[PDB]
Design a protein around this ligand. Structure first.
Ligand SMILES: [Cl-]
Ligand SMILES: [Cl-]
Ligand SMILES: [Cl-]
Length: 361
């Protein structure tokens, strides 16, 4: 069997305001819920400490099928091991995969990942915009069926990705983006970001049954410089080339590169740098056997449009995506729009993606 990454999130350094509420992670247990795409019977999970400056010390990890919110089906709970060990402690900047574990993972299903921490500092790697409630209880409760009075926090910590073993040809679509991809305005706990809607359509169609979708969106992200979280260029290798089975990359990013410009000259400079960055990413993906699909968008909100040079430059970017011939194909969301992000808009976007782009090889 070969590994395929079925779920991912893009890690970053957690800002102070996005650290969990009391009692905190230190010495406590955190239960987190994710939606997988392709299913299977043998799994492994990777945890990331990539952006922290302190060690990540974990006493135990389990996986289970959720029942309702913070509870799990007790008969499904399985412990992870790390080179046989219950626990791990990994250096600043490192990550770790669990050993393989037998686990019946249904496609398009929710998985509860429960982590019991040792000492945790204020320097933590995670994904704040989870769009999903996580649950904290005191002490070591990795295998507790029912969490009593858990503290709720709508953030993810430590997670990176889940891989499944496959026997049939199976491949992943990775999606690099900002908050439009990460799911701003999607429904909390609903797992209804546009990549989830697209993922469900792949799984419901026989010719794309073995195609997973990896959400590498980060809210506020920029491609070239600035923004929130590591830039797309800086996280490209770690997020896109570091998974299992990636065959396609969708790029939906760049608006924030222009949204922060304050004069027309800087807007022009950031537009040129963004177009150069697209080519660097296309070339890197091609070198690794990955096709790249460029996605257009119209900027959301009013703050982008209060200075007119921004939209005039953004129209040039959309035109380059459409007409430069550098992308292997184009997903023209902007044109479809013209025919604030929210759940209905993500349903529309997810239904628009052409499944025929995910069928060759
Ligand atoms: Cl969660
Ligand atoms: Cl994903
Ligand atoms: Cl954003």
């Amino acid at each position: 069997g070969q590994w395929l990454t079925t779920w991912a999130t893009a890690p970053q350094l957690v800002e102070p305001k996005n650290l969990p509420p009391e009692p905190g992670l230190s010495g406590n247990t955190l239960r987190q819920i994710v939606r997988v795409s392709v299913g299977g019977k043998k799994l492994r999970l990777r945890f990331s400490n990539k952006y922290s400056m302190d060690s990540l010390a974990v006493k135990a990890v389990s996986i289970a099928v959720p029942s309702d919110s913070s509870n799990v089906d007790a008969a499904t709970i399985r412990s992870l091991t790390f080179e046989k060990k219950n626990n791990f402690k990994i250096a600043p900047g490192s990550d770790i995969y669990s050993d393989e574990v037998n686990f019946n993972l249904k496609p398009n299903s929710l998985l509860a990942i429960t982590v019991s921490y040792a000492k945790v500092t204020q320097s933590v790697t995670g994904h704040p915009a989870s769009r999903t409630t996580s649950f904290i209880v005191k002490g070591e409760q990795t295998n507790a069926e029912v969490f009593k009075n858990p503290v709720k926090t709508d953030h993810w910590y430590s997670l990176f990705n889940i891989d499944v073993k496959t026997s049939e040809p199976s491949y992943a679509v990775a999606i690099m983006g900002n908050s439009i991809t990460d799911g701003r305005g999607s429904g909390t706990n609903r797992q209804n970001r546009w990549p989830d809607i697209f993922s469900q359509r792949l799984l419901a169609n026989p010719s794309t049954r073995n195609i997973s979708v990896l959400n590498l969106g980060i809210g506020g992200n920029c491609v070239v410089r600035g923004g929130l979280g590591p830039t797309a260029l800086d996280r490209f290798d770690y997020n896109i080339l570091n998974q299992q089975g990636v065959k396609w990359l969708i790029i939906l990013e760049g608006v924030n590169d222009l949204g922060g410009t304050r004069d027309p000259d800087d807007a022009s400079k950031r537009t040129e740098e963004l177009i150069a960055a697209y080519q660097v990413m296309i070339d890197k993906a091609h070198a690794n056997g990955i096709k790249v699909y460029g996605a257009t968008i119209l900027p959301f909100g009013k703050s982008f449009y209060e200075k007119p040079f921004r939209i005039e430059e953004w129209k040039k970017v959309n035109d380059w995506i459409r007409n430069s011939g550098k992308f292997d194909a184009v997903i023209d969301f902007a044109k479809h729009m013209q025919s604030h992000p929210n759940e209905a808009g993500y349903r529309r976007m997810g239904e628009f993606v052409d499944l025929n782009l995910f069928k060759n090889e």
